[PDB]
């Protein structure tokens, strides 16, 4: 289910799900690097009726995974609220900014 | 008996040309600009733009400018962010201009890669992830200024009524205006009053741009205006796109490059969809609404054919529409747009099309 | 015969892999890429080398030698992909072989498109 | 409270891994190796290989070797042809080995990028367009020898029974054998007698390779043989793959990496299609034929599923087939192959698949 765009954690994913790319929700595929920075989303968990802070770190330094492409936009805002924005490459400040896939890291409520 | 030659120019005249910016997101290091003839849908050529390229045509119509990122070994090695100058007719590379390694990497909104009205300066968005605006002096072929005043702001709206002024949208709901000197350094700046509520009524960044004012649509279908006939920007709004019967189906705007203004008529084009709710702000157009900006009323509505981005040609009364892969050509000389033709397969992943400047 | 000048033909016919002279083409037909059968699209460069072969002309009944030059130094055109193999042979007959990049010796070897140049009878 | 981490290794064991070389011909500057688990079809990772990459796994299963071309600005700037060494488990770049700028740019036949049986040398095809074979000393990370003796020949067939010996196929219809000294320079060489007629019965380059011999199929369904069990190469052929019913229906071979040999049984696997004529030699498989090479008779024929390339694993008695986009897994422990599974969308444009080595 984590490989579905509909999965509740993925509510502001623009990119390829790292769990389809040889990694997981919380691990970059081998030989790709986590972005230290990220857009943030607020997602509703249907299992406990609570909302959570999700961090959308990219995995960087390999070419596009191409698998499980998502474009979900819950609470996403334009570049004037930059850390809520998902139309930019969150690899932008990595040693290599080439975009590989996106993770969905649970931060807190 | 026959011999193969290079050195050739685009077959169709510049007035026939459009530029489909293909991000090729599945293979984002091989982004490119596809050049098409809008009158017959013929493929005329292309400009390679490496990783996540951006594009615009010089205001005089002689050059194409690209912005892109290279690395020594693509996925490793030293980064070079650059602007490139390409000849518009030959589609050959001419000049590379060095940028600091922080040019915006992101989807192809017009406002990320622009120029001053006089054509003398390229004006671009930086993100490191701190934001600033970068100024490139075209005649010099150099980066000449980092507008750090624009921190916490996003995107570039040039003022058509001034040689070298532009605005940007700021996190406080206001606009920041930058006026450049002749050397491309900030000569003056001004900040508007709050135009929109960032939390309650966020606007799409895409301007419906007039000679002396810019209109902006909101997530909930409101309209905001920034008037720059004077040195200080005057802000107004909102007024609603929706009449009473629209409100039942929860019609809202959705798309990327989602609005346009036909300057002579004051008609604003907007991509709309029914059943709007949180997270539907990038949904394809079910419909294109045509609004009179003066009377603040819809004058026409047509089917949207899943479009996401558009552009307008003032001189020929045309609207281009783009669903990501296909380009539709509309005649907009009358309030109701007429569909002229569809260019299929113009791109694999494009969110931006532009006309070659004529007049 | 008119059969010999693609410039004079209907575009839909010249831009097809079944067009009589495109008989050993591997790649994107230049005539779909902003060029013509005998001109590189703007900003792409002719390969000085090529694979070669003969094609039968169903129209005038004769056989022709074709030189299959590429245009080089821009990224893949991506339009009108052909993979015809009439009289193509493996790399131990190297100039009859079309599974290599005939842009390989160009100043920039990036493959853009390919075409079919009429050498003669 | 979750934390994102990198530095991880391929999650499945080596013996489950396959390597699908995706040329991505539509965007050939972004070719890549897709790493798959053949047992369940899970994508395990990938290695980026720029323009028209080629790939193999080190004989010892520890490293992945790629061969590719870079330019400083991709479509302009100086050329760099390289081999790269990558960790097989971490899928990370380790080392670049400079090559002369003439490495073969072409479709991914096995025989363009190989290694010696001892695994100490990488043996690669050059085309400038004059042909030669390049030797890379793996441990020294240097290109060490240029085999211009191989001019007018094509591709590398390593002899599994000798540590540093390999053959290539020549325009005279015979084979050239090269034996390397401990330093990668050519110590000796020999030319076989003519194996096939170049004009009348050209063979596909892909060997069905045994420990001490190799079989080749021809455009017209004949089989040829090179025996290197002894001091000099002994050649034979033709024998036909075709019986009378076969010939009447004009069955012939078609594909790229189109043959395989199961060494234990002597079974040869060949992609075949009916209605063969000039120009069909790369046609998708209508069928896979299984030939017993001692008795010279077909023991099985099954649906081709449009396959174009294949590879065999000895220990697990497996055959993979590949139609450009999908990988099919077959159990070949019995004369009749059993279809185990299809991996869908394993590549966009792949003509080569390889098992991780298990010996
Ligand atoms: N998570 C953001 C991926 C992405 C979204 N837009 C992009 C543009 C260029 C590179 C990457 C991206
Ligand atoms: N006409 C030759 C195109 C071509 C055929 N095979 C290729 C492999 C890589 C690059 C280009 C090619």
mmCIF file of N, CA and C in Angstrom, chain C residues 12-51:
data_model
loop_
_atom_site.group_PDB
_atom_site.id
_atom_site.type_symbol
_atom_site.label_atom_id
_atom_site.label_comp_id
_atom_site.label_asym_id
_atom_site.label_seq_id
_atom_site.Cartn_x
_atom_site.Cartn_y
_atom_site.Cartn_z
ATOM 1 N N UNK C 12 3.906 12.491 -45.977
ATOM 2 C CA UNK C 12 3.452 11.289 -45.287
ATOM 3 C C UNK C 12 4.093 10.003 -45.847
ATOM 4 N N UNK C 13 4.453 10.036 -47.128
ATOM 5 C CA UNK C 13 5.112 8.916 -47.796
ATOM 6 C C UNK C 13 6.615 8.870 -47.521
ATOM 7 N N UNK C 14 7.286 10.026 -47.564
ATOM 8 C CA UNK C 14 8.720 10.129 -47.251
ATOM 9 C C UNK C 14 9.042 9.882 -45.780
ATOM 10 N N UNK C 15 8.076 10.168 -44.909
ATOM 11 C CA UNK C 15 8.283 10.075 -43.468
ATOM 12 C C UNK C 15 7.903 8.727 -42.873
ATOM 13 N N UNK C 16 7.784 7.734 -43.744
ATOM 14 C CA UNK C 16 7.409 6.389 -43.373
ATOM 15 C C UNK C 16 8.618 5.472 -43.535
ATOM 16 N N UNK C 17 8.749 4.497 -42.636
ATOM 17 C CA UNK C 17 9.846 3.524 -42.698
ATOM 18 C C UNK C 17 9.743 2.623 -43.931
ATOM 19 N N UNK C 18 8.557 2.586 -44.541
ATOM 20 C CA UNK C 18 8.342 1.770 -45.732
ATOM 21 C C UNK C 18 8.774 2.448 -47.037
ATOM 22 N N UNK C 19 9.140 3.727 -46.957
ATOM 23 C CA UNK C 19 9.620 4.498 -48.109
ATOM 24 C C UNK C 19 10.847 3.797 -48.714
ATOM 25 N N UNK C 20 10.841 3.610 -50.037
ATOM 26 C CA UNK C 20 11.709 2.588 -50.670
ATOM 27 C C UNK C 20 13.188 2.719 -50.299
ATOM 28 N N UNK C 21 13.664 3.952 -50.109
ATOM 29 C CA UNK C 21 15.086 4.164 -49.863
ATOM 30 C C UNK C 21 15.488 4.099 -48.393
ATOM 31 N N UNK C 22 14.513 3.995 -47.484
ATOM 32 C CA UNK C 22 14.807 3.878 -46.046
ATOM 33 C C UNK C 22 14.995 2.410 -45.609
ATOM 34 N N UNK C 23 15.621 1.590 -46.453
ATOM 35 C CA UNK C 23 15.532 0.125 -46.264
ATOM 36 C C UNK C 23 16.482 -0.485 -45.234
ATOM 37 N N UNK C 24 17.474 0.287 -44.808
ATOM 38 C CA UNK C 24 18.373 -0.176 -43.744
ATOM 39 C C UNK C 24 18.605 0.936 -42.705
ATOM 40 N N UNK C 25 17.508 1.530 -42.242
ATOM 41 C CA UNK C 25 17.557 2.669 -41.334
ATOM 42 C C UNK C 25 17.322 2.236 -39.913
ATOM 43 N N UNK C 26 18.270 2.583 -39.044
ATOM 44 C CA UNK C 26 18.141 2.397 -37.610
ATOM 45 C C UNK C 26 18.220 3.779 -36.935
ATOM 46 N N UNK C 27 17.065 4.289 -36.513
ATOM 47 C CA UNK C 27 17.023 5.621 -35.876
ATOM 48 C C UNK C 27 15.896 6.498 -36.385
ATOM 49 N N UNK C 28 15.932 7.777 -36.011
ATOM 50 C CA UNK C 28 14.837 8.717 -36.237
ATOM 51 C C UNK C 28 15.063 9.403 -37.571
ATOM 52 N N UNK C 29 14.090 9.322 -38.481
ATOM 53 C CA UNK C 29 14.222 9.958 -39.808
ATOM 54 C C UNK C 29 14.359 11.468 -39.684
ATOM 55 N N UNK C 30 15.471 12.021 -40.171
ATOM 56 C CA UNK C 30 15.700 13.473 -40.099
ATOM 57 C C UNK C 30 14.543 14.317 -40.670
ATOM 58 N N UNK C 31 13.824 13.779 -41.652
ATOM 59 C CA UNK C 31 12.751 14.537 -42.322
ATOM 60 C C UNK C 31 11.534 14.791 -41.409
ATOM 61 N N UNK C 32 11.538 14.149 -40.226
ATOM 62 C CA UNK C 32 10.536 14.309 -39.188
ATOM 63 C C UNK C 32 11.030 15.169 -38.033
ATOM 64 N N UNK C 33 12.260 15.646 -38.159
ATOM 65 C CA UNK C 33 13.001 16.215 -37.042
ATOM 66 C C UNK C 33 13.383 17.660 -37.317
ATOM 67 N N UNK C 34 12.754 18.253 -38.323
ATOM 68 C CA UNK C 34 13.058 19.625 -38.676
ATOM 69 C C UNK C 34 13.937 19.757 -39.899
ATOM 70 N N UNK C 35 14.334 18.628 -40.489
ATOM 71 C CA UNK C 35 15.234 18.648 -41.633
ATOM 72 C C UNK C 35 14.533 18.090 -42.844
ATOM 73 N N UNK C 36 15.311 17.663 -43.834
ATOM 74 C CA UNK C 36 14.749 16.875 -44.936
ATOM 75 C C UNK C 36 15.578 15.593 -45.089
ATOM 76 N N UNK C 37 15.234 14.765 -46.067
ATOM 77 C CA UNK C 37 15.993 13.543 -46.340
ATOM 78 C C UNK C 37 17.481 13.837 -46.528
ATOM 79 N N UNK C 38 17.803 15.021 -47.059
ATOM 80 C CA UNK C 38 19.199 15.344 -47.375
ATOM 81 C C UNK C 38 19.756 16.555 -46.621
ATOM 82 N N UNK C 39 19.035 17.040 -45.615
ATOM 83 C CA UNK C 39 19.543 18.154 -44.796
ATOM 84 C C UNK C 39 19.361 17.858 -43.303
ATOM 85 N N UNK C 40 20.404 18.108 -42.523
ATOM 86 C CA UNK C 40 20.326 17.954 -41.088
ATOM 87 C C UNK C 40 19.390 19.022 -40.523
ATOM 88 N N UNK C 41 18.583 18.675 -39.513
ATOM 89 C CA UNK C 41 17.828 19.679 -38.775
ATOM 90 C C UNK C 41 18.792 20.744 -38.261
ATOM 91 N N UNK C 42 18.328 21.992 -38.109
ATOM 92 C CA UNK C 42 19.204 23.095 -37.681
ATOM 93 C C UNK C 42 19.960 22.745 -36.401
ATOM 94 N N UNK C 43 21.260 23.014 -36.406
ATOM 95 C CA UNK C 43 22.076 22.861 -35.223
ATOM 96 C C UNK C 43 22.542 21.443 -35.011
ATOM 97 N N UNK C 44 22.290 20.570 -35.993
ATOM 98 C CA UNK C 44 22.869 19.216 -36.009
ATOM 99 C C UNK C 44 23.767 19.044 -37.235
ATOM 100 N N UNK C 45 24.750 18.153 -37.122
ATOM 101 C CA UNK C 45 25.902 18.086 -38.041
ATOM 102 C C UNK C 45 25.951 16.728 -38.760
ATOM 103 N N UNK C 46 26.220 16.734 -40.073
ATOM 104 C CA UNK C 46 26.340 15.476 -40.829
ATOM 105 C C UNK C 46 27.509 14.640 -40.336
ATOM 106 N N UNK C 47 27.322 13.329 -40.234
ATOM 107 C CA UNK C 47 28.449 12.427 -40.027
ATOM 108 C C UNK C 47 29.225 12.278 -41.335
ATOM 109 N N UNK C 48 30.552 12.378 -41.276
ATOM 110 C CA UNK C 48 31.369 12.215 -42.486
ATOM 111 C C UNK C 48 31.388 10.752 -42.952
ATOM 112 N N UNK C 49 31.045 9.846 -42.039
ATOM 113 C CA UNK C 49 30.939 8.416 -42.308
ATOM 114 C C UNK C 49 29.493 7.964 -42.138
ATOM 115 N N UNK C 50 29.234 6.703 -42.482
ATOM 116 C CA UNK C 50 27.893 6.146 -42.488
ATOM 117 C C UNK C 50 27.973 4.657 -42.757
ATOM 118 N N UNK C 51 26.895 3.951 -42.465
ATOM 119 C CA UNK C 51 26.731 2.624 -43.031
ATOM 120 C C UNK C 51 26.105 2.764 -44.430
#
